[PDB]
Amino acid sequence: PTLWSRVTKFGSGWGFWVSPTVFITTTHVIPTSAKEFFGEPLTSIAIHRAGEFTLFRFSKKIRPDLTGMILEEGCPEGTVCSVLIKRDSGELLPLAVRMGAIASMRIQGRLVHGQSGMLLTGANAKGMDLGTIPGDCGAPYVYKRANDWVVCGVHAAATKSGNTVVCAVQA
Amino acid sequence: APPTLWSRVTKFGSGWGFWVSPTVFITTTHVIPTSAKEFFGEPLTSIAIHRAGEFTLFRFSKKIRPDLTGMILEEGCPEGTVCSVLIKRDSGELLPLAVRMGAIASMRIQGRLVHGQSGMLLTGANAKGMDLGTIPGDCGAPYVYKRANDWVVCGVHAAATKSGNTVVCAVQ
Ligand SMILES: Nc1nnc(-c2ccc(O)cc2)s1
Ligand SMILES: Nc1nnc(-c2ccc(O)cc2)s1
């Protein structure tokens, strides 16, 4: 029983199973041509979009091995989240992120709205194993609170150092 | 981390060891099977053993891993160096956990006395549990870091606190 089981390759990045029926990802990684996802006809899937945040709800249990998790709109300022990065190499890369305010930020030429954060590995990501790269978009932001894991958003963007990041959030 | 470093990480006793060269193998002293009289088809008598607390080095009289080149082993690393701990987990999953290295320290952990180079994991607020942190079976996994032009190995996983971010690297 692991959080990592819920991180799934999806379009040009990743997504996360909140429940047996609920899948979250970053809008810009979703395929733009499709009749079905995970074997289910697109005609039977509810899609809820808010900027760079997308939620899918399926009409049957795709992952009945899972329990439903808490999903919240971002987290308090100063929370140290973990971004759960999967790589095509086979690497699992949980990185600490100190979270700040919600904002519209300029990132490599584009405007991105979500919760800002800064990696604790700091300086420059120097090595692919201490920061994010473009293929990582849709990875989840999580933290432990009392006994429960909380998911509060998905990886939307990062500056050239790979050290300022944006977490797209619900609503 | 490069495939040539993960190929050196070998399942061993109750954890792992690390091939520094074709003839040199390092591990954490407490993962060694205390009854073992033979390793990789060689008798104990044909092997040189160097032991300093939780650090153990094996030197063989012939090439066990001829596919490898010798790499640099140092005695810990400068304070503030960021290392990866190269942890293998269930079914080809590779978990290179980020750690900021601190001072040489002596601690009591789970009642046991441990000595080596302390570090603070950079994976979450606290690393309690297997998704963000280390578990007993991780002991012996190597601490590596990249410099300008190459990679260095600077010790082996010896211990971690109950419910915190603190780990200890046994050093030469
Ligand atoms: N549109 C929706 N917003 N939240 C939903 C949710 C959250 C947590 C769960 O475990 C399952 C569903 S549905
Ligand atoms: N006693 C020893 N300390 N270091 C050794 C070493 C280092 C790098 C190598 O490639 C091979 C051996 S032997």
Curated annotation (Swiss-Prot), chain A:
Active site: residue positions: H28 (for 3clpro activity), E52 (for 3clpro activity), C137 (for 3clpro activity)
Function: Processes the polyprotein. 3CLpro-RdRp is first released by autocleavage, then all other proteins are cleaved. May cleave polyadenylate-binding protein thereby inhibiting cellular translation.
Domain Peptidase C37: 1-171
Included range, full protein: 1102 to 1272 of 1788
Organism encoding this protein: Southampton virus (strain GI/Human/United Kingdom/Southampton/1991)
Reaction catalyzed: Endopeptidase with a preference for cleavage when the P1 position is occupied by Glu-|-Xaa and the P1' position is occupied by Gly-|-Yaa
Name of the protein this chain belongs to: 3C-like protease
Subunit architecture: Homodimer. Monomer; in solution.
Curated annotation (Swiss-Prot), chain B:
Annotated catalytic residues: H30, E54, C139
Domain of life: Viruses
Limits of the Peptidase C37 domain: 1-172
Covalent S-S links between cysteines: none
Reactions this protein catalyses: Endopeptidase with a preference for cleavage when the P1 position is occupied by Glu-|-Xaa and the P1' position is occupied by Gly-|-Yaa
Job description of the protein: Processes the polyprotein. 3CLpro-RdRp is first released by autocleavage, then all other proteins are cleaved. May cleave polyadenylate-binding protein thereby inhibiting cellular translation.
Assembly: Homodimer. Monomer; in solution.
Protein name: 3C-like protease
Organism, scientific name: Southampton virus (strain GI/Human/United Kingdom/Southampton/1991)
Lineage: Viruses, Riboviria, Orthornavirae, Pisuviricota, Pisoniviricetes
